[PDB]
Amino acid sequence: DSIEDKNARVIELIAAYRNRGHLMADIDPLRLDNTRLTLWDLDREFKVDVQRKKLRDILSVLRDAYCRHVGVEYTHILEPEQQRWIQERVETKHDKPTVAEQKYILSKLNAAEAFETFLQTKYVGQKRFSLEGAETVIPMMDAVIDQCAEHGLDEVVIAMPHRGRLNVLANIVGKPYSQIFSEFEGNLNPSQAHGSGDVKYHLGATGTYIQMFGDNDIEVSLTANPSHLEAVDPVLEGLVRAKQDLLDTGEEGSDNRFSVVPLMLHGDAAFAGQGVVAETLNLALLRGYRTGGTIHIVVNNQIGFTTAPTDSRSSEYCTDVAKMIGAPIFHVNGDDPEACAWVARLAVDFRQAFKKDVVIDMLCYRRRGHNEGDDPSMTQPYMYDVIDTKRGSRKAYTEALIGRGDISMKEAEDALRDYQGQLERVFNEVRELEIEPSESVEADQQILATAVDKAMLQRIGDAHLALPEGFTVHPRVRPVLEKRREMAYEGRIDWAFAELLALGSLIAEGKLVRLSGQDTQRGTFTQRHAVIVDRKTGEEFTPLQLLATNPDGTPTGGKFLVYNSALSEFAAVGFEYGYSVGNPDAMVLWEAQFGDFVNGAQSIIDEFISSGEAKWGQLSDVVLLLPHGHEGQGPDHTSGRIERFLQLWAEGSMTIAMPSTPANYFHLLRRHGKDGIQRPLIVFTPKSMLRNKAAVSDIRDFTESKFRSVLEEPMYTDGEGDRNKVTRLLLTSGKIYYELAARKAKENREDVAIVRIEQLAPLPRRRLAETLDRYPNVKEKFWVQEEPANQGAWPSFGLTLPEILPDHFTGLKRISRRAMSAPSSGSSKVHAVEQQEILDTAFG
Amino acid sequence: DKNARVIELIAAYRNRGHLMADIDPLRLDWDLDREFKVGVQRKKLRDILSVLRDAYCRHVGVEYTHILEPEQQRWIQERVETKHDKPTVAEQKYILSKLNAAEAFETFLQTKYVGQKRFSLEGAETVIPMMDAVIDQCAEHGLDEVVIAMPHRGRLNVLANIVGKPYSQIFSEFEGNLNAHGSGDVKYHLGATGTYIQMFGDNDIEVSLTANPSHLEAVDPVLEGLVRAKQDLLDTGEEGSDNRFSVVPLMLHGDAAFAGQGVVAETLNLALLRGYRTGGTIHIVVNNQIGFTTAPTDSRSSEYCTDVAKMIGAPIFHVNGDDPEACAWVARLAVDFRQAFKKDVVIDMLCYRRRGHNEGDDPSMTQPYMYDVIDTKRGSRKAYTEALIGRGDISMKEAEDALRDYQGQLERVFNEVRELEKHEIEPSESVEADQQIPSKLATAVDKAMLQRIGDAHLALPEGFTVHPRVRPVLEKRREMAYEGRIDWAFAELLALGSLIAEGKLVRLSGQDTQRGTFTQRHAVIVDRKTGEEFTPLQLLATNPDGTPTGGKFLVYNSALSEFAAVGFEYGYSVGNPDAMVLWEAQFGDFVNGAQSIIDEFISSGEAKWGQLSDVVLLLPHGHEGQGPDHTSGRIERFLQLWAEGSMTIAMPSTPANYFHLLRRHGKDGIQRPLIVFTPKSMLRNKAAVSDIRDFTESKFRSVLEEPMYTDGEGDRNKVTRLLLTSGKIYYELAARKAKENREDVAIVRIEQLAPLPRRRLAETLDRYPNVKEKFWVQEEPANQGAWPSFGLTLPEILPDHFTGLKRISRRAMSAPSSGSSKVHAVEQQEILDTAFG
Ligand SMILES: CC1=C(CCOP(=O)(O)OP(=O)(O)O)S/C(=C(/O)CCC(=O)O)N1Cc1cnc(C)nc1N
Ligand SMILES: CC1=C(CCOP(=O)(O)OP(=O)(O)O)S/C(=C(/O)CCC(=O)O)N1Cc1cnc(C)nc1N
Ligand SMILES: [Ca+2]
Numbered sequence A: 001d002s003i004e005d006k007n008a009r010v011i012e013l014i015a016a017y018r019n020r021g022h023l024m025a026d027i028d029p030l031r032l033d034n035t036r037l038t039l040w041d042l043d044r045e046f047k048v049d050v051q052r053k054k055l056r057d058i059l060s061v062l063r064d065a066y067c068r069h070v071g072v073e074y075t076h077i078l079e080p081e082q083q084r085w086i087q088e089r090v091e092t093k094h095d096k097p098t099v100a101e102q103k104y105i106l107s108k109l110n111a112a113e114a115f116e117t118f119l120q121t122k123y124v125g126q127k128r129f130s131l132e133g134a135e136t137v138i139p140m141m142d143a144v145i146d147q148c149a150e151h152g153l154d155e156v157v158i159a160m161p162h163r164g165r166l167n168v169l170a171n172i173v174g175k176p177y178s179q180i181f182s183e184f185e186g187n188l189n190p191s192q193a194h195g196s197g198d199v200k201y202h203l204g205a206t207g208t209y210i211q212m213f214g215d216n217d218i219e220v221s222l223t224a225n226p227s228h229l230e231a232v233d234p235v236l237e238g239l240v241r242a243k244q245d246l247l248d249t250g251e252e253g254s255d256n257r258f259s260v261v262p263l264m265l266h267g268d269a270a271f272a273g274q275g276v277v278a279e280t281l282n283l284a285l286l287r288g289y290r291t292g293g294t295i296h297i298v299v300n301n302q303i304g305f306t307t308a309p310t311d312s313r314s315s316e317y318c319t320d321v322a323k324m325i326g327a328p329i330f331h332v333n334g335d336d337p338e339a340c341a342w343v344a345r346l347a348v349d350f351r352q353a354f355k356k357d358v359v360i361d362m363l364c365y366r367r368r369g370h371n372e373g374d375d376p377s378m379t380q381p382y383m384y385d386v387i388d389t390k391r392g393s394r395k396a397y398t399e400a401l402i403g404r405g406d407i408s409m410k411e412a413e414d415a416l417r418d419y420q421g422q423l424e425r426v427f428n429e430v431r432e433l434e435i436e437p438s439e440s441v442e443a444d445q446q447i448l449a450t451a452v453d454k455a456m457l458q459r460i461g462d463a464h465l466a467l468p469e470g471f472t473v474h475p476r477v478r479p480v481l482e483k484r485r486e487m488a489y490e491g492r493i494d495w496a497f498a499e500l501l502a503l504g505s506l507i508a509e510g511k512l513v514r515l516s517g518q519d520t521q522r523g524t525f526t527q528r529h530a531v532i533v534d535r536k537t538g539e540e541f542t543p544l545q546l547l548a549t550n551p552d553g554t555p556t557g558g559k560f561l562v563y564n565s566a567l568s569e570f571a572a573v574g575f576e577y578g579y580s581v582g583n584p585d586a587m588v589l590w591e592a593q594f595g596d597f598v599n600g601a602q603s604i605i606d607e608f609i610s611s612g613e614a615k616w617g618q619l620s621d622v623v624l625l626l627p628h629g630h631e632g633q634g635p636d637h638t639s640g641r642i643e644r645f646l647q648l649w650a651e652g653s654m655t656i657a658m659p660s661t662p663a664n665y666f667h668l669l670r671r672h673g674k675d676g677i678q679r680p681l682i683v684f685t686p687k688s689m690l691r692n693k694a695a696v697s698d699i700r701d702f703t704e705s706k707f708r709s710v711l712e713e714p715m716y717t718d719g720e721g722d723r724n725k726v727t728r729l730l731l732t733s734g735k736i737y738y739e740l741a742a743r744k745a746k747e748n749r750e751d752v753a754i755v756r757i758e759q760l761a762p763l764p765r766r767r768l769a770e771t772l773d774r775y776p777n778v779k780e781k782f783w784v785q786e787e788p789a790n791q792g793a794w795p796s797f798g799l800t801l802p803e804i805l806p807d808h809f810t811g812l813k814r815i816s817r818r819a820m821s822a823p824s825s826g827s828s829k830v831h832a833v834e835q836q837e838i839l840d841t842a843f844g
Numbered sequence B: 001d002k003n004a005r006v007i008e009l010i011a012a013y014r015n016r017g018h019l020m021a022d023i024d025p026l027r028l029d030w031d032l033d034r035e036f037k038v039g040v041q042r043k044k045l046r047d048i049l050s051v052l053r054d055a056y057c058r059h060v061g062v063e064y065t066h067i068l069e070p071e072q073q074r075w076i077q078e079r080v081e082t083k084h085d086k087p088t089v090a091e092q093k094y095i096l097s098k099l100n101a102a103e104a105f106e107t108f109l110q111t112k113y114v115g116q117k118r119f120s121l122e123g124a125e126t127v128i129p130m131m132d133a134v135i136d137q138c139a140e141h142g143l144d145e146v147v148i149a150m151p152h153r154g155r156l157n158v159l160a161n162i163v164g165k166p167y168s169q170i171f172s173e174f175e176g177n178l179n180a181h182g183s184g185d186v187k188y189h190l191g192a193t194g195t196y197i198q199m200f201g202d203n204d205i206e207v208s209l210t211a212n213p214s215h216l217e218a219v220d221p222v223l224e225g226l227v228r229a230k231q232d233l234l235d236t237g238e239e240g241s242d243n244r245f246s247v248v249p250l251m252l253h254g255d256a257a258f259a260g261q262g263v264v265a266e267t268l269n270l271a272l273l274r275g276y277r278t279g280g281t282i283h284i285v286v287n288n289q290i291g292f293t294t295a296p297t298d299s300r301s302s303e304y305c306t307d308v309a310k311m312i313g314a315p316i317f318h319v320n321g322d323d324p325e326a327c328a329w330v331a332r333l334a335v336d337f338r339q340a341f342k343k344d345v346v347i348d349m350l351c352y353r354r355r356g357h358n359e360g361d362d363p364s365m366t367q368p369y370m371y372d373v374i375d376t377k378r379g380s381r382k383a384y385t386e387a388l389i390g391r392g393d394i395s396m397k398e399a400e401d402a403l404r405d406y407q408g409q410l411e412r413v414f415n416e417v418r419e420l421e422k423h424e425i426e427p428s429e430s431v432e433a434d435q436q437i438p439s440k441l442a443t444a445v446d447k448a449m450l451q452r453i454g455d456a457h458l459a460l461p462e463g464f465t466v467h468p469r470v471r472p473v474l475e476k477r478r479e480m481a482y483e484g485r486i487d488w489a490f491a492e493l494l495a496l497g498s499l500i501a502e503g504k505l506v507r508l509s510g511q512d513t514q515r516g517t518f519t520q521r522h523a524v525i526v527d528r529k530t531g532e533e534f535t536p537l538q539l540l541a542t543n544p545d546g547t548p549t550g551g552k553f554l555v556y557n558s559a560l561s562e563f564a565a566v567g568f569e570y571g572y573s574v575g576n577p578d579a580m581v582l583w584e585a586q587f588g589d590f591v592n593g594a595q596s597i598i599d600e601f602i603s604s605g606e607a608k609w610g611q612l613s614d615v616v617l618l619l620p621h622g623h624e625g626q627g628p629d630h631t632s633g634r635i636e637r638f639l640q641l642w643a644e645g646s647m648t649i650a651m652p653s654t655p656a657n658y659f660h661l662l663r664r665h666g667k668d669g670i671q672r673p674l675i676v677f678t679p680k681s682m683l684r685n686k687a688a689v690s691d692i693r694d695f696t697e698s699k700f701r702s703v704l705e706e707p708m709y710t711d712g713e714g715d716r717n718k719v720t721r722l723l724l725t726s727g728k729i730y731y732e733l734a735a736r737k738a739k740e741n742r743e744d745v746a747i748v749r750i751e752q753l754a755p756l757p758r759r760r761l762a763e764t765l766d767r768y769p770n771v772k773e774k775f776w777v778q779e780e781p782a783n784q785g786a787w788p789s790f791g792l793t794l795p796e797i798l799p800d801h802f803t804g805l806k807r808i809s810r811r812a813m814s815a816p817s818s819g820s821s822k823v824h825a826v827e828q829q830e831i832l833d834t835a836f837g
């Protein structure tokens, strides 16, 4: 009504465009959804933040920035400087691309569409999950990578699903067309045939991107992945984080460049529905997981196979999950490749300025069916009636560039004729060039002293008392530090100290050690104390970090990276798997709170850890620490599901162990870090046995011994025990050994021997046969276990042991809990009665 | 100019005031008299600012300007930016009684069971009066039930002080003396049911608490499923006549678990979906600013633990746990918002954890600053009590007497319990015999029923335009119903349609389940010209005379989730035991995304909690050369999980046997999950078809012989080699036998993998007296499929029949299959050549 009233209505209007203008922006190239102050005041001047501008001018700047082909979501960001940064770059006149840059974009759209159309012609009946209707993804990714090269970064690491995967591999990464054509030909040379393999749209590649108009180059990698959509997200993060740590960039680096950029592509239905997306975004700013911001690209073809977005998500945008970490979101029209390239460059600039994630929602469509053989009009007839009227983005942009006067019709035709002639000469060459069953990858990696000097044990012990000046140790943490120095010099080394002796000795030898998991710094069972907290100030101290410096003051090259993970299994296990792939020379350990929670990461275990080598030739040396054992804490605090990992095992893909002594655990970890084999290690670790006074080791077991896959009772190897008196053999693994040994001693049963299987997979066949041959008077052999009959090692051992060793194990019987639906009973009293029945049966 | 600066200030408070609000009980981190323009009324700046400070910068942080619906922003704004009437002395006293019960229950167990883990709510006592206000507000709206799901934090306190679980039952559990059945679970995993009666109102409401494992947040989709089934039974909500959503999910969370677990996002993503919505969940985050020894800085990459809830535009209220009046008020506002917009609401209760993570843990080892502050802090109960003695509401004597009365009541129940005669502790027993199958059960239907389901596919609405490639499916189904040669996809719909016709509620969902991943189902058909939907099976919900059967066909395309979708269907089946609930995986290879649900609820829920579920998992399975993720439903994993007859596991080879399996499952009266390994290419195998007689005069066959012996000129006595198999490999083996005229070889199919059909298998094998060798033949690698369990169990349960049983399979493999279809083809031929070698 007044001057103060009008100037106030304008400020609300400005805010309305900045907050909700994205809901009006012309972002959908299909235009499916139909429902998507006075006139004298437009020429009046108003106060804007400090200059005076006309309302018409304020309105035109706002409609240009927020209501054209780019929908900007940023007012949810809590940091005001990030809101100002976006506002300043979005609310200004944008410099038009040069004719050369426009021609370059069209060349990318040409190769994108001509690649898809060549495959439709040659291999009409072969699934390729085409990028048709989304070809702008190619110039957009090219702009992301080019912008990264402009900032002088070292590498872009890509992870993506099926949508236009082959197109990306050929036109962004640089994977030869001959290789991609040999895969459709179904004829692979012995190197491409090796292992069991995977489908062509799961494969990765590496290359060097060279700037078209710049002088920089950048490494471009694409990681392998399963069909399981979004499963590769935390794997990419881990991979990038390991590479950043090697380059001394990022979080654990001297420079704050985060010079390895994660570029993560997603489908619209997969991005909204999969939980691992939220779990992975939740890591984006964590000290132990951040990679300085990921560039996310959502290929939003407004469809997920036959499912409409209305049935796929409960939110406006498929990208709304990214608001949880305050990521800016750019919804961009896939038919405007210049707006797509510009947004991609802005996204990289934002990542570089704030070391935070950025989401690009590319609104497009899927020209053909879900796969190339599918008819989408059965379920989406309206959408496909609209798509059938739509001229592709390539034709649209070509007609735009001719009208502008940039290129001629002849120049456009010739450019496509050249590219079509090139694909045909490559296809002919491969076509011009016997299928056998897949072979096991076991022999692919074959290959050891793990003992350390007394001085090394003493150094790791002393490190626990080499406290900074003034440091106030918690009075209940102080005895751990003092008892460890004593253990290092006097023996009776417990499990938790043996672990740190192995990690510390590896650090001292120059190895990078990464250890993480839930409450892993202290230890779930208050046993580790890898990090100690000053009682008065809260300052942290990591005793093992002192081992990264030689006594002369020089660095060993080693480092101790220990973290408390977020409350995740899927993303945390994915990340550590990725980290180990990213740095094969690192010692990477992930610890479950209890092994019962690793089933939250079942997709990682099944799709990456146990099978990644056979499927993609991708090697990982990740260690999974799974606290395991029947102690009466209930069905979710008892089992690490040994039977599942043993079932998954084949082709020597993993090592699976359940060590019974601290020294054997020490040697197992050192063998794993020093063997030069990149294969995952699954370890079933103790809980109560951490504080079992019988479960301790002598210094000579660390300094003069090695890993023992099979263990005999000390009375026959280092004592006065007679192996010829033994009539009954009890074969076992884990903590049940001490309970059986205590019963044998109590009853003086010289007729019974207890043999421990420390390495569950691969089965130590020769070692087991050699050990059993030392007991010639054995009349009966029993596999004894705590676990229910359908769980533990019995389901695999009961079947494999009589087969691999018939002369030793024909007639092998089982002593265990009954078969159970849950891993144990809920009552500790019921556990106690069942545990005593096992001991009574074994000695009956 | 000034009026414009005032509007920016109003917006600043509404948008960012929550970042200044005094929400943390630990505290760890001139123009004012002028009138301004703000219906359109003129208000002084002092009053504008007072309203803004009271609403957004005191003990309540309000996050709502992210909500895209303007009407929802106006609704919150109007209720938050007004003077709030102070609670009556009676209401304040009622809140104190709740704080009294909460802290005295925790202090009583500390005194009596010093050495037992109870995950105390000390420092978060306000959770109890807050939950009481949520439930009371639901009763005020005249709703029917509140269904609760929560983790460990103050679980026993909630059971005793909100749900109504007897103290005697809770004490008897700490005493380790139980009057228990199945293998059971820990006390803070248990559920209860009861009736809440309003203190100052005339209404009552049912209050239920669901069971759950240690796996944090895994119960979230299960609660939604449970609520959805109850809402469908009451004809309320999405599939109901009235839009009341009269059953309320009340979901409690811990701050670290809410930020870190993916299933939270997956479950919020369901909140407005047609097939999953429950009309809005009330979320309560017990934000004690700690997760065991982990600081929030290591737990999340966002300001608030609740930021994940902004993806569905849920309003978020950050409330100071030391202000129980503000907590009760926010809880009531939450219920009012849920009722008005049928959307989720998140209450972030900022509190602390008085003791260690568990009662035996020392938290100062890792959080000495936090525990130095907590040891200076007077509890919420003492604070509130002192504020009341200060306001003049109550005397010191009245406060003491109330605590003495409650403490005396606890001591009397504890002693009565202690006085009970102890029982001898025995090992847990198998729950197998708890649910007995009716020996003989009729699943056959009349030919008229098949014909009705066939005719329903052509009973199209007037003017409906069928897609030309969908039309032959509809016509071929009417022909199959009258003439036979019924394929797998039609037998599925014959089973579901016959159940609907008999009055059963059928819920079928999964990824692209309406059409079918393999374009086979067409449960829903789409008008080619308009896009209008038509569900032929829905016509079976009406009898020929026009009356309802009571049955219903609920078929949906799920979101792209496994964990939340499997969790939801598990919950749905628990919520309505009389419903037929089927969840379909796109390929069985993706069910490992829901491994926590399979391991913690489906396979073990009966033995742990006595919780029964009849959920059906449909897992497309088979070696066809599509790669390691499009081949196996991990049969070996489900067989390994099986014990105590907890589940039925089948791999049917004929459409009729699948039909009878589904009907037996829906009509047996047993509430046990069914795992079905279903076909892909075999859906279109012309040999894999059934006669009408198999649906009308037969029953489910756990073991199947070759038709040449049961219905042909085959001679069983000529058989010297027996091949034992399951699934689609049967047709390839049968085709090879026919090609080579091998009368010396017989192929026996095991249709029901678990429980093993011991008697039928023994009776079948006895019909082949000249057998000299038996082989288990399978497509799956040696360490996979049925061999790992059958190779061990078959020679044990049937030694006279299976001693010397050998295996024919793919080699043991790390991946479920090779990546090349050419390599699959060569391996498949080697199996067939070995079996007939
Ligand atoms: C549901 C599903 C698909 C629909 C994906 O929808 P979007 O995310 O919008 O992607 P597009 O529209 O296809 O670009 S593709 C798909 C495939 O099999 C990928 C092709 C492959 O690599 O094999 N699956 C099946 C599927 C279901 N659940 C999970 C966790 N992962 C899956 N891959
Ligand atoms: C990590 C973890 C806990 C810390 C939880 O932190 P918050 O969410 O902030 O909860 P509180 O502070 O304890 O209220 S409790 C817990 C327990 O086992 C509770 C006792 C029980 O229920 O048996 N686990 C272990 C855990 C790890 N991962 C998964 C998926 N679930 C878990 N339960
Ligand atoms: Ca290694």
Ligand SMILES: [Ca+2]
Binding pocket: B614, B664, B665, B666, B667, B668, B669, B670, B671, B672
């Ligand atoms: Ca049933």
Ligand SMILES: [Mg+2]
Binding pocket: A267, A268, A269, A299, A300, A301, A302, A303, A304, A305
């Ligand atoms: Mg899509």
Ligand SMILES: [Mg+2]
Binding pocket: B254, B255, B256, B286, B287, B288, B289, B290, B291, B292
């Ligand atoms: Mg907490």
